Design a protein around this ligand. Sequence first.
Ligand SMILES: [Mg+2]
Ligand SMILES: [Zn+2]
Lengths: 49, 146, 49, 50, 1122, 49, 97, 50
Amino acid sequence: EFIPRPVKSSFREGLTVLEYFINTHGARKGLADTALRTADSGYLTRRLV
Amino acid sequence: KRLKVVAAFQQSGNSPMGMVLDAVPVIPPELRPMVQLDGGRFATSDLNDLYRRVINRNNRLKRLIDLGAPEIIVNNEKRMLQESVDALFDNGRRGRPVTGPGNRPLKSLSDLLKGKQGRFRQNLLGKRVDYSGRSVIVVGPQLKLH
Amino acid sequence: WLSAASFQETTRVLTDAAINCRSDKLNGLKENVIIGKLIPAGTGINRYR
Amino acid sequence: VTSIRIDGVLHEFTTVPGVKEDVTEIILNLKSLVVSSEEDEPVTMYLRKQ
Amino acid sequence: NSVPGAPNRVSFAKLREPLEVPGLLDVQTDSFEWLIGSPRWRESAAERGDVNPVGGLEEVLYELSPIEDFSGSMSLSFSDPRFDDVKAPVDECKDKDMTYAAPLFVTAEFINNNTGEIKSQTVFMGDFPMMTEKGTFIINGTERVVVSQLVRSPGVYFDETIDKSTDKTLHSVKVIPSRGAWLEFDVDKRDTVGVRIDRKRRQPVTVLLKALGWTSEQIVERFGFSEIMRSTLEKDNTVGTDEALLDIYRKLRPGEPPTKESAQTLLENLFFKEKRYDLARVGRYKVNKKLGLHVGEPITSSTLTEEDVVATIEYLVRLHEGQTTMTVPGGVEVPVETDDIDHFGNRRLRTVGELIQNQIRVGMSRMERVVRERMTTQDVEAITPQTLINIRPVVAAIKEFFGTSQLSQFMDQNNPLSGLTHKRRLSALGPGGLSRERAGLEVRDVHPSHYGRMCPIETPEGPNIGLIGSLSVYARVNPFGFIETPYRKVVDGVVSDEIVYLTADEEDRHVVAQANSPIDADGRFVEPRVLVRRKAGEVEYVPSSEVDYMDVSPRQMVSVATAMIPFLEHDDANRALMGANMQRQAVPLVRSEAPLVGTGMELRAAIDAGDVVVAEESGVIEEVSADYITVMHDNGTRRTYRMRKFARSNHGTCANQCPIVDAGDRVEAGQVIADGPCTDDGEMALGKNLLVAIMPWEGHNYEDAIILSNRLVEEDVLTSIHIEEHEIDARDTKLGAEEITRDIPNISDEVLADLDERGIVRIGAEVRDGDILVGKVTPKGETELTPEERLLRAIFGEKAREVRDTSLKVPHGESGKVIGIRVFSREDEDELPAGVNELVRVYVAQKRKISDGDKLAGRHGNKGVIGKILPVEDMPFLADGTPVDIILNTHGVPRRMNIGQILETHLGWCAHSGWKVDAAKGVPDWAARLPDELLEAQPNAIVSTPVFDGAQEAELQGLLSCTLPNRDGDVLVDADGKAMLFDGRSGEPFPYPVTVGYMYIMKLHHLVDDKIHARSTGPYSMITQQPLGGKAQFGGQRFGEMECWAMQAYGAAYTLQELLTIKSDDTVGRVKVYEAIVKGENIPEPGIPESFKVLLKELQSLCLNVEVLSSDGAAIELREGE
Amino acid sequence: EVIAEHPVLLNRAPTLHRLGIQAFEPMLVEGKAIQLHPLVCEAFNADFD
Amino acid sequence: LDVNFFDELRIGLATAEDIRQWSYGEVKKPETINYRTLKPEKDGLFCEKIFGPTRDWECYCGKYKRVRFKGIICERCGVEVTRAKVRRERMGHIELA
Amino acid sequence: VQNRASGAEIGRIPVDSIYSPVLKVTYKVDATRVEQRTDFDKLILDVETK
RNA sequence: CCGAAGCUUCGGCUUCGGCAGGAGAGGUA
DNA sequence: GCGCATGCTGCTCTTCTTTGCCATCACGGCGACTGCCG
DNA sequence: CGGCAGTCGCCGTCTACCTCTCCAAGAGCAGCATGCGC
Ligand SMILES: [Mg+2]
Ligand SMILES: [Zn+2]
């Protein structure tokens, strides 16, 4: 769910400690579910063949 | 549910008596090799022990039967022989697995056919080949499409 | 039974095939690959061979 | 300069007793020598210190 | 700063620091100090809370004893552990393939109650491996590291879920011990509570309360506020306690006659007896804190009690109803809430001491069982403590832990940073944790309680993402296993300077401010409102009048490798992850140099790693050479330090130490005396400074490729030394004894010219593929011959001639000089394995330059292989004729959000050239906040920009217009950081300005010379006669299942058939194909593969009658032979 | 002249479709790396890192 | 063999008669291999009589060691004088009591 | 040049050779492009040696 | 099948000598 | 001078499963089954 | 008898490559070989 507080600074100005910390919550979920997707798709391909 | 089993043994010319064994086959020796471990000793084969257990139990059973033993002891030996054969054909299906050095369960005859690391999916559907190589690829912009 | 034994559940299919005394005609891609013959597709069909 | 040869030394991965640099650093230091020659054949110089 | 002799690195930081980073290896040494019980830990524990200085082994030895028998006539006890001196030094153990250990002794006493005599004597309990001063163990000659484990702690855990049909709230309870049986109370679809004893069946809790000895009126007297309890007490049909015990017995024990005394002895043997149930000190302390039981008394005894069960049921029902606070008779008020199990207040850390103590306990229990069983079969008056004790289980457990274990890992010694990082790793797997397959997606998330205890960035990239992490710089561990972190207390809106360490369970009741907060001279916040952290990791904007704590530094939440990236706040998390991971893969180069732009963490990341030499006292240097330094102390003592010249690490790299002092210098204690592998004057240096251009160039840097210059090969800028090791063994045989000698009757004299008079090579010889290292022969037996040959070869000549050839040769594709030989013999009193006579090791070294295919990297996530190397005349060059060193593409920067590299190049150019700010009319407006020493710099200056408080963009933009000119009065790079370049192939200038600067480039350990492979024919397997696998065994490449589908979709029926029969398995066709190719004829027709026959013989052994029929029956033989 | 007009097959894993295997005509280069055309990287899905 | 002549692959349950047919002999002793003589035992799991000679055109004794004596069964040892590749395709059986 | 490929003693150490005596070269062109279509170029070269 | 050594009529013949399985951890695309 | 006793040493197996040891094991789909309630 | 719902077990979870370490041992039963005693 969205956090009601935004990140008002671009990467050209540099984030602070708290903005950088709360930015990492959603940047790890994608990296963690890509690896599961790769193993979920190969089984489907093998079953379809 | 029952007719599927009762009709298969009727439509063909086989018998339902092939489910009870009275002789056990033995694989050729070159399919279960035993080799030296770098000038030391031999360290297990995972299949020459499951055969040895069956042979020992059968020999003890034969000697006890041709001796006039009481019924209880003969029954105990027969149960133990049955368990040993069952562990030879499928280790871990009933009871606890038979382990070796290091509490590592032994691998039976039916464990060399199943799984993604078995015969079917690792030796028959894909192999290693001659005349092949490997290296790191880099970009060449002076080549053509062929 | 050769094509189904190499997909999944080897023990169950092998047991049922043994009980039923099934016969395989070796007329597919997977079986012809397994026994070492020309697959019945592409240049392995009668017209082109 | 195409080659060097030190006494008491077999390869370049070693040290000389009494000298503060190993042979690798000595070679890397000798890589900046500026020399001039006129003959068309190899010539040999010398270096002795104590 | 704070180090006696250090380079002067000026900094852009604007904040001050009230704390110094702790010892970076104190997470490893403190636990071993506690386990050993040494005086240092005793004094440290006496510093605060000196109640029970109990060692690690002493508590095990005291929980064990006394050991009693069934009759109760004799007993045995243990006490007073003590250690001897270490047998051999570290280097001897590393050389002769030994273990670094010291013997352990305990005292045992034997009391006999029948008589009353006592016999006590000292027993020996085996060698105990010991940890060196760097936090590592040497086991069988190899360095190892034990890694800490993150496990869920014992206690009581309340949960709540949503129903499916009625769609309401359902609650549960789980009491988890350290070792014992489990309990589980919960509420069901209807208003019926139930207990699950020992993970079986389900009964209403009324039977349990009755089995505890409770009447039907006391339940209402206590639990008299819920209709659920009314329904449960009404429907129990177990009036009378004995009926309840009988029902419990029949539920637990199957097929038994229910007997009440057996039921009692089985009930009190499950939870209430301190022999088979253990709620450890952590578990007892947690249960005494969540339920709010008696608090204040010291913890003694670690078993469950009846009041605990009653309080747990009361808590569950109160949580079900909806109450928020709850009190217990004799306890304080406690909140009523459901707890999360991934919270860092619930996950504890099992360090090395508690990992070794478990194995010692297991061995102790086995030995105790043996002594108890053997105490009743020996004769009295001959029983002594030495005859009852067996040492084998303990040594077996110790050697099984330190060897085949998942947590004592092989150390990685690529460079000092990787070694330091290996020792600070928190691992979530292992025997008692998780699995790579069972672990889901919620245990791999950044919890809000990780702030200051775990690093959110440094984590693996493959299947172990989120299962391995790193400790933060300021974190430290409780005496229970909970990680703490420091804060500065604020009162009345003014920040004080008193530091308090808080665990994750205590900082959620306070408002904690942010590190980057404006603070005046007195200490009052400038901004009216500040960004804080509330209870549940919630971020809010509240005003600077109600906060209670503050952070200690902006780098409190990062690890030691993440705190080494300049301009980190300008980079995305995904690229910074790779940047931190790739700093541990750099290789040491023959010459090192420190970064032009750094962070300041590089000085204490090299001293704490331990690959440098520091002085233990103050004095003057007396003598300096290439391998020793002699220091004369002020009192008179003289100390000498030796160096490791060209030593091989765990990964084949070179570890070389060099002195950096003169012959008359004065040295202060703590000063760095000698350099190391990746060190430049005391600070870590993993790469080199190179001149960059950001532009596309003819497609040679397309898709992450890199173009290099030829000056980087002719000047040894990126060159490394790699060392290899080979061994061979001479042993006996049943037909004789193998001997190493130069005499070999099979090979010529041309290849035996580099051997000495002993059969070994000579130092300084250049070996190649197929070359000879040692010469050894094998006897084939000395026996008699036939009577005719006696006289026949007496006339001719008869010799022994039983010698075969077995010589150690250089493997395929290897070369290099020989730099050392280590020979071990049996007759000269050297430890050797039984059965062997002589050992020899040979070391081979090579020098590797840079080439196409080698991997380069930066600190921000840039990564690619080298596509081309160009002559220096083909390279873009500046207006004065200076060529560039590397070209990087501009298409990869914007879409990956790593713009810190461009800022780094700008600052690097400014630092290289040097600047000077004019203050004739006062300091400019943009330089108001700069220090006074950063208003002027010299060429080739070193600066420092901390990780979250560094150089701004107004400062960079203003410094880019102040740089000094070169030899001639020209400024090549203008105010935007762009320069005009010429084209080195055509001569015309490039039409638009290009960005130029300096950047820090490292060389990664992925070299193309170790990845090229090819094969035509070679060794084959034994069971299935397919080619072998691997590069060391000259193996083939797998043609898998997914690669066959492409062949079948193309329509290629002949390529697939040839690939599957005559190149893999067809034994008879393999030879005929080779003969046909050599003779130039046509390739023959494939046969039948061998794996099919192996499969058929496998199927026939399971009593399956599988046959191959023909067109008219008549099964084919399928075995050849005719 | 031995390797003149003798094609070879290049393969990258995973082979997710047909174009993961293609046939080229070899040329001898200097170095220890294989050189690939820029226009086949989309079919092979291969960057250069 | 020619793969272009196969037509079927039949599977089914095996009886004791078939198991006794496939076998070339019965194993009796659980012994595996002689550690000192480095030669297979007798009636063991690696026996030369049941399965086949370990070396080409050889036997347990030394009466026949050439290639012209093939086809003759050794009368004192019982080992066939033939190739050593027959150890990959000859089976045995155990007689259960 | 490896000493095993030239027939030399063990103590000899081969060394890389850089024969170039030139350090830095650059050039600058000043172009006269006045009207009347009478135009010419001027070249200035700088050579620095060792 | 390879090497060494003899005969060798140049097709080849003879003597001797010789092997490759599992578990765990980390990493790259 | 001879017989008996005890330690080097060949020499070939042997290694379980209770009232014990042992501590657990995801997550979803599917199908029998089995005591249990009516 | 006749439904019935929990339950308990069995099946499955991407490909290719590189580097390192470690893989039952003590107990027991003869079979003598030599020393010591009457
Ligand atoms: Mg890539
Ligand atoms: Zn014979």
